[PDB]
Design an enzyme around this catalytic site. Structure first.
Site, PDB file in Angstrom:
ATOM      1  N   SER A 113       2.095  -9.744  -0.401  1.00  8.13           N
ATOM      2  CA  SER A 113       1.624  -7.977  -0.481  1.00  8.13           C
ATOM      3  C   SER A 113       1.864  -7.330   0.980  1.00  8.13           C
ATOM      4  O   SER A 113       2.127  -6.138   0.862  1.00  8.13           O
ATOM      5  CB  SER A 113       0.102  -7.947  -0.882  1.00  8.13           C
ATOM      6  OG  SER A 113      -0.529  -8.767  -0.032  1.00  8.13           O
ATOM      7  N   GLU A 134      -9.823   5.694   3.420  1.00 10.12           N
ATOM      8  CA  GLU A 134     -10.611   4.218   3.804  1.00 10.12           C
ATOM      9  C   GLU A 134      -9.420   3.413   4.196  1.00 10.12           C
ATOM     10  O   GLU A 134      -8.290   3.073   3.577  1.00 10.12           O
ATOM     11  CB  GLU A 134     -11.527   3.783   2.935  1.00 10.12           C
ATOM     12  CG  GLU A 134     -10.863   2.717   1.747  1.00 10.12           C
ATOM     13  CD  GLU A 134     -10.081   3.310   0.472  1.00 10.12           C
ATOM     14  OE1 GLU A 134     -10.271   4.560   0.440  1.00 10.12           O
ATOM     15  OE2 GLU A 134      -9.283   2.762   0.052  1.00 10.12           O
ATOM     16  N   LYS A 167       0.710  -1.184  -0.005  1.00 10.14           N
ATOM     17  CA  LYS A 167      -0.054  -0.049  -0.109  1.00 10.14           C
ATOM     18  C   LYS A 167       0.911   1.240  -0.093  1.00 10.14           C
ATOM     19  O   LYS A 167       0.253   2.257  -0.561  1.00 10.14           O
ATOM     20  CB  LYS A 167      -0.910   0.050   0.977  1.00 10.14           C
ATOM     21  CG  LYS A 167      -1.986  -0.932   1.203  1.00 10.14           C
ATOM     22  CD  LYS A 167      -2.988  -0.881   0.088  1.00 10.14           C
ATOM     23  CE  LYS A 167      -4.067  -1.804   0.369  1.00 10.14           C
ATOM     24  NZ  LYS A 167      -5.125  -1.964  -0.779  1.00 10.14           N
TER      25      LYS A 167
HETATM   26  C1  LIG Z   1      -8.073  -2.926   2.275  1.00 12.28           C
HETATM   27  C2  LIG Z   1      -6.845  -2.979   2.730  1.00 12.28           C
HETATM   28  N1  LIG Z   1      -5.722  -3.916   2.625  1.00 12.28           N
HETATM   29  C3  LIG Z   1      -5.821  -4.722   1.507  1.00 12.28           C
HETATM   30  C4  LIG Z   1      -4.666  -5.673   1.367  1.00 12.28           C
HETATM   31  C5  LIG Z   1      -4.732  -6.565   0.254  1.00 12.28           C
HETATM   32  C6  LIG Z   1      -5.916  -6.183  -0.960  1.00 12.28           C
HETATM   33  O1  LIG Z   1      -6.170  -5.032  -1.478  1.00 12.28           O
HETATM   34  P1  LIG Z   1      -5.605  -5.061  -2.989  1.00 12.28           P
HETATM   35  O2  LIG Z   1      -6.514  -6.092  -3.835  1.00 12.28           O
HETATM   36  O3  LIG Z   1      -5.982  -3.507  -3.384  1.00 12.28           O
HETATM   37  O4  LIG Z   1      -3.797  -5.148  -3.110  1.00 12.28           O
HETATM   38  C7  LIG Z   1      -3.457  -7.122   0.059  1.00 12.28           C
HETATM   39  N2  LIG Z   1      -2.832  -7.542   0.768  1.00 12.28           N
HETATM   40  C8  LIG Z   1      -2.626  -6.561   1.969  1.00 12.28           C
HETATM   41  C9  LIG Z   1      -1.323  -6.683   2.978  1.00 12.28           C
HETATM   42  C10 LIG Z   1      -3.601  -5.562   2.219  1.00 12.28           C
HETATM   43  O5  LIG Z   1      -3.380  -4.806   3.274  1.00 12.28           O
HETATM   44  C11 LIG Z   1      -6.088  -1.900   3.727  1.00 12.28           C
HETATM   45  O6  LIG Z   1      -5.314  -1.983   4.161  1.00 12.28           O
HETATM   46  O7  LIG Z   1      -7.075  -0.678   3.931  1.00 12.28           O
END
Ligand SMILES: C=C(/N=C/c1c(COP(=O)(O)O)cnc(C)c1O)C(=O)O
Ligand SMILES: O=P(O)(O)OCCNS(=O)(=O)c1ccc(OC(F)(F)F)cc1
Ligand SMILES: O=P(O)(O)OCCNS(=O)(=O)c1ccc(OC(F)(F)F)cc1
Ligand SMILES: C=C(/N=C/c1c(COP(=O)(O)O)cnc(C)c1O)C(=O)O
Ligand SMILES: [Cl-]
Ligand SMILES: [Cl-]
Ligand SMILES: [Cl-]
Ligand SMILES: [Cl-]
Ligand SMILES: [Cl-]
Ligand SMILES: [Cl-]
Ligand SMILES: [Cl-]
Ligand SMILES: [Cl-]
Ligand SMILES: [Cl-]
Ligand SMILES: [Cl-]
Ligand SMILES: [Cl-]
Ligand SMILES: [Cl-]
Ligand SMILES: [Cs+]
Ligand SMILES: [Cs+]
Ligand SMILES: [Cs+]
Ligand SMILES: [Cs+]
EC number: 4.2.1.20
Lengths: 395, 268, 395, 268
Positions: free
Chosen positions: C376, C108, C86
């Protein structure tokens, strides 16, 4: 007889029960062998780069030095896998353990960062890991207890004495004196009997080597000073080592001042203790008039230890490094300042080093100085402790 | 003085081994500790090994850790230990007395002064647990200058160089370690290693006392039969103290019984 | 009218109240301008390198693929400052916010990683940050709430609806519709109205660019597949983007299967939902027969969202990317496996991707395949949740 | 039909503005909602704006969010809303009825079919809150094919291009947004922007109704004096429902009082 010098001036040595001498000699021989082994060096380098994430960034502070003549960089050991500098030398010692045909690891931990490092390296390299941790530290560094156990390490609370790092150290050494045939003692700081202060330095020295290359690239010169917190001494000696022969570069070590030196509730033996023999070494320690070892104190579990590694005692004695102290309240202010003004949450141990650098700047704000703080770890493990304090404080 | 030399000569003449109990000085208090020590002697102890309470005894397991803690709870200091030692010697002129020390307590206010205090009160030997032969020079020098025997350790895996150093540097008795690990009654050491016993004799070492994990008469007999000059038992003795804290008369009766049985075993 | 295409085939668009259209057009123009601005690119690159710690390692698994013909690498976004991918695009959007003369940030967050990223970037770059977070997520991702607040961000619990990510999204957009004159909405995923799916991809694409360079260096070829979890879609599109034109490279996205697709308690609209209009976009979503938006579910807060970014819907429609699901129990097993056998504690979101890669290996263990999982984030935020589960489970 | 055109012609002849309340269909249940709507009409409403409950109403603040939730708690669905609309029209043949919709509810089972249902029941306009002019083509096309007015929004900062598009694409009335943000009685919008009112007239736009934050007679008067054809009030009306849930007779009396006062203000 040893291959390498066990002493730094008066300090150091191998003050262990006779039973353990063969194990220390075996470790020393294995280290000397490995240091000249290109395959070992390549394996260690590969783990550091591709597993742990070296080299770590050198970040210029954008905000906290505004309006002064201080330029401050932070060496980002907080970005290393595991969250502290501890991971560097654990990877080297784990490879030594395997080299010596050992399949089990004993470690002590205070902040739980060395325990996390030991556990992760053991999971990766197929070693069975047990970690001693003082019961007070099990509470105040609880996120690390969960991390160690999820990685399959056994975590053994130590209720004896102060229930903090020295007590975990005691239990680790007691265990090793009975289990050394199968277990390697993965000591987590630049202290204890030879050859640990030497091995730990040599397996942490990339910190200062990278710092030097990075500051030359960004500034075209060496720092005026490098500043690091000092528990047993590993992150500080790792930062200092490559600068020792650069006589213009100040080396500043920061011991924990606790509630204030005058209260006796601190962990600053190098400046406020006196030479003694404990934990396998001749070194400054906090001790009673009669020579009982005193209990230390610091808000930070990683600094809460009543002795210090012998190379720091030596560097101080000859004036090559200067040692100062920072209190719990000074550390907390530095923690808050870095979070709010740089967006980095530092370990409370590392916050001691930062606090001293901030003092150097604030005391003499028109003094031109290029400083590096070793930001030894991230403060995830501390966020509950700090929160509880700031709340009770009424913030 | 020659207290160990005289003891071993007497024991040899009687074709007998030594039984040497260990206790912590001042556990569970000064007066009770003095009574405990007199009981050990009356029940047949040939010599004593006496601990000075130390904050961080890294060669001791829980039983003796707890002995140290009880002495500290009674406010016992090294100075009070030396007062006790003077009283013990004044009562018992010939029994060899050896101290179990950790390095910091010896090094604290000067190594020479420590050994000088030992001589003053009539101590015969000092064993510094966390000082290996490799670091021993100032300790053994100071000991010999003050007519104190410095005690060194022969571990199970001792190599030849170590055997020769221990034989040369030590006096009084040689400590023959039963096993690796720390003190403790529950963790029984192996049979005395005949090879080490025989090598120490070849090198004219001080006579060997086997220690660590010796908790039963059978183990005492086995040590002597293997050619050791005797055996030391600590945790087994200390457990009797710990068990009987609220029953001091029962404590002494049980100590007497145990010591008598262990000593009988030394005649084997 | 826009400068760039707001659609990916049928999917995407700008389905917001008319009031917000100028703000979106302004953001698009600022992005196009910045993308061609060497000073902006240099500032962004400097932050990524020297502040966030890029490039992140590519780690070869040493243990978990033993006895199979799978070679598995993990792209270590868990080592990025803040603890997840992120942070990359937040640094770019924060610079855009400053470029547009805005001094406040709305974000958010679900897992709290985007919130932590937003808070750290705001502290560094001098922006006032407020973060909406569903009340359920405030509880299950609590370490991140402490982290955000210590960095001076305001964290606003959202109790409406499911009290999870969609509810935080709703409140963020409601706020922005009133505060856009002074506030930038720092949307944290590759979803929402144009230009967010495009900007987020372009500010995450270094993930796949670095992966490609790293796998070429180590293997001398491209991967057979790259695998990433999909909430809104940012980490997956960041990994996928640079491989889209490498037709041999599989692109596999992993949606959360929750308690099982058949239970309806999941977050897998791309494969199990149907096209709808919500949160500013035309995209697959979980919806009732009548077109009410359904509440999603996942053990992982970061995946607990009933829609998906429009570029993923597009890539699926044309067959360029394949999408699968992984249940909570599969994710937990992968979490445990990585901790115990590689010494890496992954985020539960990332554990979905790993779980699918482990299935690919285990189902066909003699299939020769070179895989990359986008790891991630790190799982510090999850350790209490996982502990509580494994305990209730009787482990 | 020509219900808005006829209303505005009649209002013009009387030199009067429109007062248009908003409520959520089925809040707090179907029967009470029907009584509420009849009360609004009897008390002087010139037209109605009626919400179909939606799960995620992103242009609404808490008051109307809560109206949607109450309708859902009463099990209200779009199908039941269409049943209500048929009953309202059957009672009230000339009053213009406009729906406040979110895009997903229109798009759900086909845009054309949605507008066809609206025509069937005798709805006059549809305002899709989250569809800007830029995305409006299939919505406005379907609306016009089924004799429904598509309503578009003129925000305070509307540029000339937007003014021209809204004038061209919209029918029935033009929505003149008071302020940025979401619906809510507490957040009072600015005075109607004369420049926008005048530009919409220059471009022959449908007559303007000012909405968002209009909660008092003074604001209604100010809208008409600025040249708007009338004003919409939602949250202020809904608050009366929320306040009086346990007192349905008092609810209707207070709605009647408020609506009457707001309508009186439209004559200014
Ligand atoms: C929605 C959140 N996080 C999503 C997230 C995700 C899934 O979101 P994306 O599909 O945008 O990568 C994947 N891996 C990690 C470590 C994450 O924190 C947030 O931190 O607000
Ligand atoms: O019977 P146990 O198992 O309690 O053993 C009691 C031994 N007491 S002692 O003073 O001989 C003794 C001797 C040596 C020690 O450590 C060292 F070997 F490292 F030097 C510790 C205690
Ligand atoms: O009096 P308030 O503040 O409650 O306002 C009530 C308005 N109700 S409404 O149906 O006109 C209405 C009109 C437009 C809306 O959103 C949009 F502008 F984006 F299209 C939302 C509601
Ligand atoms: C004692 C521990 N930690 C110490 C520590 C220290 C102090 O130890 P050294 O003096 O050995 O660097 C500094 N910074 C961090 C982040 C630390 O975790 C431990 O983790 O076991
Ligand atoms: Cl040995
Ligand atoms: Cl063990
Ligand atoms: Cl062993
Ligand atoms: Cl200097
Ligand atoms: Cl002394
Ligand atoms: Cl002698
Ligand atoms: Cl606008
Ligand atoms: Cl606000
Ligand atoms: Cl605004
Ligand atoms: Cl493929
Ligand atoms: Cl529909
Ligand atoms: Cl029309
Ligand atoms: Cs400066
Ligand atoms: Cs210390
Ligand atoms: Cs493999
Ligand atoms: Cs999702």
């Amino acid at each position: 007889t040893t291959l390498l010098n066990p002493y730094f001036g008066e300090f150091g040595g191998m003050y262990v029960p006779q039973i353990l001498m063969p194990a220390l000699n075996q470790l020393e021989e294995a280290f000397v062998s490995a240091q000249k082994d290109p395959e070992f060096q390549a394996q260690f380098a590969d783990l550091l780069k591709n597993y742990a994430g070296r080299p770590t960034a050198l970040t210029k502070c954008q905000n906290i030095t505004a309006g002064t003549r201080t330029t401050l960089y932070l060496k980002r050991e907080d970005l290393l896998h595991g969250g502290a500098h501890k991971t560097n030398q654990v990877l080297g010692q784990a490879l030594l353990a395997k080299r010596m045909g050992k399949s089990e690891i004993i470690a002590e931990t205070g902040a739980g960062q060395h325990g996390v490092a030991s556990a992760l390296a053991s999971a990766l390299l197929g070693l069975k890991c047990r970690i001693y941790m003082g019961a007070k530290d099990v509470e105040r560094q609880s996120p690390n207890v969960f991390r160690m156990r999820l990685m399959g390490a056994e975590v053994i609370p130590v209720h004896s004495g102060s229930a903090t790092l020295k007590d975990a150290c005691n239990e680790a050494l007691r265990d090793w004196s009975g289990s050394y045939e199968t277990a390697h003692y993965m000591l987590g700081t630049a202290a204890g009997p030879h050859p640990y202060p030497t091995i730990v330095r040599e397996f942490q020295r990339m910190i200062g080597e990278e710092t030097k290359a990075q500051i030359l690239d960004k500034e075209g010169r060496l720092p005026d000073a490098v500043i690091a917190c000092v528990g047993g001494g590993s992150n500080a000696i790792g930062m200092f080592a490559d600068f020792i022969n650069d006589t213009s570069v100040g080396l500043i070590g920061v011991e924990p001042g606790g509630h204030g030196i005058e209260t006796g509730e601190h962990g600053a033996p190098l400046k406020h203790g006196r030479v003694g023999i404990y934990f396998g070494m001749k070194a400054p320690m906090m001790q009673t008039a009669d020579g009982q070892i005193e209990e230390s104190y610091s808000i930070s579990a990683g600094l809460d230890f009543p002795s210090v590694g012998p190379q720091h005692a030596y560097l101080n004695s000859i004036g090559r490094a200067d040692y100062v102290s920072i209190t719990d309240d000074e550390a907390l202010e530095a923690f808050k300042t870095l979070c709010r003004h740089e967006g980095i949450i530092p370990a409370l141990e590392s916050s001691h080093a930062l606090a001293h650098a901030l003092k150097m700047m604030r005391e003499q704000p028109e003094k031109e100085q290029l400083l590096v703080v070793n930001l030894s770890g991230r403060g995830d493990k501390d966020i509950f402790t700090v929160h509880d304090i700031l709340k009770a404080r009424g913030e | 003085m020659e207290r160990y030399e005289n003891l071993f000569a007497q024991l040899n003449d009687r074709r007998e081994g030594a039984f040497v109990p260990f206790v912590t000085l001042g556990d569970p208090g000064i007066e009770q500790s003095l009574k405990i020590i007199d009981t050990l002697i009356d029940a047949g102890a040939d010599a004593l090994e006496l601990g000075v309470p130390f904050s961080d005894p890294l060669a001791d397991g829980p039983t003796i850790q707890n002995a140290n803690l009880r002495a500290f709870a009674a406010g016992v200091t090294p100075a009070q230990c030396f007062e006790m030692l003077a009283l013990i010697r004044e009562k018992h002129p010939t029994i060899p007395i050896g101290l179990l020390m950790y390095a910091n307590l010896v090094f604290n206010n000067g190594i020479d002064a420590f050994y000088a205090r030992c001589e003053q009160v009539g101590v015969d030997s000092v064993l510094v647990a966390d000082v290996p032969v490799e670091e021993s020079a100032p300790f053994r020098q100071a000991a010999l200058r003050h007519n104190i025997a410095p005690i060194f350790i022969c571990p199970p895996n001792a190599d030849d160089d170590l055997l020769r150093q221990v034989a040369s540097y030590g006096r009084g008795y040689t400590y023959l370690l039963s096993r690796s690990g720390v003190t403790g009654a529950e963790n029984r050491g192996a049979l005395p290693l005949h090879h080490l016993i025989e090598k120490l004799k070849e090198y004219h070492a001080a006579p060997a006392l086997q220690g660590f994990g010796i908790s039963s008469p059978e183990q005492v007999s086995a040590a002597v039969r293997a050619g050791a000059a005797g055996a030391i038992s600590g945790s087994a003795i200390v457990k009797i103290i710990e068990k009987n804290l609220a029953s001091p008369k029962q404590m002494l009766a049980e100590l007497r019984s145990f010591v008598s049985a262990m000593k009988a075993a030394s005649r084997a």
